[PDB]
Design a protein around this ligand. Structure first.
Ligand SMILES: C#Cc1cn([C@@H]2O[C@H](CO)[C@@H](O)[C@@H]2C)c(=O)[nH]c1=O
Ligand SMILES: C#Cc1cn([C@@H]2O[C@H](CO)[C@@H](O)[C@@H]2C)c(=O)[nH]c1=O
Lengths: 308, 308
């Protein structure tokens, strides 16, 4: 039987302390790798200062200097750039991932999952009037299939403490935007409810009627974001093309494993929290003997080339 | 074990893919072969407004120099994301129904285009047109869904003079430059599958770049497009992130079953030519037994909602 792998995706909204936490966890250097955020790709390789381009566009939209449509085309392109290292990495990793599986051979810790750039952030900008809901569902359509052992760590942090940390940890080109903070915090909260809804037997088509008046309520999941008028026939029915994208979203999220990390503590308190959380995460076998070292290389090389 | 035949008619626009497809479906029955048309309705209305018209106008402005390459690029990328959405969800909802490769087929699905048209060929062609970055092309490439077994793709031959003629006959604008680009791109794609089925290996042949049947030279595959200065490290090699996107391209293309159809004939000519060619096409099984009418509903639903 092949070596076992543990994949761990540290996600949730920005500004809770997810970079310093795992930086602290980025400290044996051989049997566990930390794939950092592809900052260099964001600022240089894919495009010039993408983050700056994102926050400026939202701002200019806010000031009424540009229109909702202009802001959408810019936002949509940028989200393509933002997402690409997360997309390639997944594509090359996938063949190495086997079935589910006692300490593991290799632990991979990623800064974020593809659904950050393919679902969560697009959905947030939609709530911010800077992306059409059709684009969001286009990104959703391209969400890679959910491999086994997809453990996503999401954050818990009270809004005020979050604003504090966010203010002290602003990436280059970023503007402190409390409406975006609430957009993203709400998207990620809805995302956690969405996984519980799907796992408890939730069927979106069954409860879709309830958006008009032992699991969450559909109005508390991400499905509620797509009762958008753009997506709807004259008689209020969802177009089938959009409904199929919801079927996909449902399929992808139902099989991810969600773990909540309380960030409301000290940097190494978060670290220990992350280690405690691992005992419940799902390991997978790899698919070939030389999968472990191949994975290790991809990881170290991603780090070196696109890490901050 | 019921079986299925999926055939995707692709290639540059203005050849007769659509007519030929319809003639072909018109020979089966209202129960054993189904047309999946181009989602023209999605394109003009549902996903956005007059996307085809926005694409061709944007290119015209870039040419005319009324807009920068960058402004054209964000419009083209956004438009392309929209263009490809209905292909992406269709693939995603079909995938679980498709089994291993495998007499007559229970169902035949004739598609008007494959996902890679919107996720690769038109992006690459817009890149050659100077209205998309190579980075974004690779972003679309990295999002190409895993290639299902039994992926039969029918590209088209047609002399360029005859092709120009057909086009000049007919939301678009007569762009002969674009036609060269898209013809060249689909030419490379055909070569690229051939190059890959012949055990070709782009990493080992990369240094050879500057400027059925036998294995093509890499300079005559899609790989040639991505020796662009934006993609090259100080050392003159590709950045790994781009190399990995190219690995994905090879993995997606190598398993495809490519056929060429000659469009230098009459409509019924093409139909009978395409009908002959199907004889040598790979069928697959299906997973559930009730997969077949499920798949049938989905195609008629798609056609009814997004065709004309
Ligand atoms: C993933 C991701 C994304 C990150 N970001 C930004 O990148 C930085 C990552 O912390 C922040 O400025 C902000 C969260 C996006 O704007 N879009 C994304 O899709
Ligand atoms: C699929 C598809 C795509 C079609 N098109 C266009 O659709 C138009 C059909 O009228 C043609 O100009 C061309 C086929 C794109 O420009 N990009 C695509 O990705």
């Amino acid at each position: 039987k092949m070596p076992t792998l543990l994949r761990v995706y540290i996600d949730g909204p920005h500004g809770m302390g997810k970079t310093t936490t795992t930086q602290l966890l980025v400290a044996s250097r051989d049997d566990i790798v930390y794939v950092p955020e592809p900052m260099t790709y964001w600022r240089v390789l894919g495009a010039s200062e993408t983050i700056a381009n994102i926050y400026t566009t939202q701002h200019r939209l806010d000031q009424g200097e540009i229109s909702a449509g202009d802001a959408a085309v810019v936002m949509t392109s940028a989200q393509i750039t933002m997402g690409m290292p997360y997309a390639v990495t997944d594509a090359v990793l996938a063949p190495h991932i086997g079935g589910e599986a006692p300490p593991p051979a290799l632990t991979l810790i990623f800064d974020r999952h593809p659904i950050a750039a393919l679902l969560c952030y697009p959905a947030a900008r939609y709530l911010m009037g800077s992306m059409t809901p059709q684009a969001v569902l286009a990104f959703v359509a391209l969400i890679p299939p959910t491999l086994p052992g997809t453990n996503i760590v999401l954050g818990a942090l009270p809004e005020d403490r979050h604003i504090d940390r966010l203010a002290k940890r602003q990436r280059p080109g970023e503007r402190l935007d409390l409406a975006m903070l609430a957009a993203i915090r709400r998207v990620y909260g809805l995302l956690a409810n969405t996984v519980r809804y799907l796992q408890c037997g939730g069927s979106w088509r069954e409860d879709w009627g309830q958006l008009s008046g032992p699991r969450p309520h559909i109005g508390d999941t991400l499905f509620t974001l797509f009762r958008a008028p753009e997506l709807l026939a004259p008689n209020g029915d969802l177009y089938n093309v959009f409904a199929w994208a919801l079927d996909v979203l449902a399929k992808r999220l139902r099989s991810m494993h969600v773990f909540i990390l309380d960030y409301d503590q000290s940097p190494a308190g978060c670290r220990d929290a992350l280690l405690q959380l691992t005992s419940g995460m799902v390991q997978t076998h790899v698919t070939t003997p030389g999968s472990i070292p191949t994975i290790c290389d991809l990881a170290r090389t991603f780090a070196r080339e696109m890490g901050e």
